């Protein structure tokens, strides 16, 4: 994601006075993706024994 | 600018008595050109103030 951030300020008027100017400054932000995992395993005898209950 | 300076004179007339001739001789003169400059500067705020009076 990005940002804009404008800038600038004014002065009093004059015929031969210099000219003030404005600008801006953009920035960016980042986030990180995290992954997880989980598994399982069943045996033949334990599966049959657990079915008794 | 130039000048011509013509020349010639009469000899009195007669048949078979030659023909006088005329001529000229030119000269020239030169001069130099001089140029000058002048300007003005008017501001927007200055212009309006003068228009009041």
UniProtKB/TrEMBL annotation, chains A, B:
Record organism: Pseudomonas phage vB_PaeM_E217
Q: What is this protein called?
A: Capsid and scaffold protein
Query: Per its UniProt entry, which superkingdom is the organism in?
Result: Viruses
